[PDB]
Amino acid sequence: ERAGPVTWVMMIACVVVFIAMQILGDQEVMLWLAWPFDPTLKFEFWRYFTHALMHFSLMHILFNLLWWWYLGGAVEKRLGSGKLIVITLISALLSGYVQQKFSGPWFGGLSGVVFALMGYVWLRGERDPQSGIYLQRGLIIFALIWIVAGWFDLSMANGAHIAGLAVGLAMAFVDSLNA
């Protein structure tokens, strides 16, 4: 089956944070968890990652935790918890970095981590089938529909979207060199 402790701890973290957003309001939690909006804040190191935990609607957190539990679960089960931790930490850091550049510091959501998992699971399952991981054609369809819809603003954090994807592809490429 699928139930890794990293998978579930991320799901719980996200839900705990989202409960807090509901009691305190978004901005209040945003003021503490969002990417540093002022260089003076730059040594508040949690912020480079914590933006990933914030969600701005129930639909967003469910949809994201679905993808996370599905693709995240698969990575933890087949490749270990350490691999899931690293993809998570790198993609959260890098998609937030790019996202801040694209449109400043007010954003959140696990969807950059998710696009990194999509990138990773797909390329890894392509170049390296024995990993026991793969992304289906229907889901890479929807992923592609999902990015470009963010371009055309019908998925708002585009730098996050494209950043995360890139990160997952690159790491899967690296990991698929090694066998």
Partner 1 sequence: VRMA
Residues forming contacts to partner 1 in the complex (CB under 8 A) are: 26, 30, 51-52, 55-57, 60, 95, 99, 103, 106-112, 155-158, 160-161, 164
Smallest gap from Cβ 157 to partner 1, in A, equals: 4
Residue 81 falls in the annotated catalytic set: no
Smallest gap from Cβ 107 to partner 1, in A, equals: 4
Residue 57 falls in the annotated catalytic set: no
Q: Is 141 exposed, middle or buried (0-12, 13-18, 19+ CB in 10 A)?
A: exposed
55, 21 contact by CB (below 8 A):
yes
Q: Is the dihedral of CA 43, 90, 54, 16 positive or negative?
A: negative
Nearer to partner 1, 55 or 79 (CB): 55
Residue 59 makes CB contacts below 8 A (sequence gap 6+) with none
Nearer to partner 1, 3 or 24 (CB): 24
Smallest gap from Cβ 109 to partner 1, in A, equals: 4
Smallest gap from Cβ 40 to partner 1, in A, equals: 22
Q: Which two tokens stand for residue 89?
A: 């930490």
Nearer to partner 1, 126 or 142 (CB): 142
Q: Which two tokens stand for residue 83?
A: 């691999």
Write down the catalytic residue from 51, 91, 95, 161: 161
Residue with tokens 């804040």: 41
Q: How far apart are CA 141 and CA 146, in angstroms?
A: 9
Q: Phi, psi (5° rounding) for residue 93?
A: -60, -50
Write down the catalytic residue from 111, 131, 155, 176: 111
Nearer to partner 1, 143 or 160 (CB): 160
Provide the annotated active-site residues. 111, 161
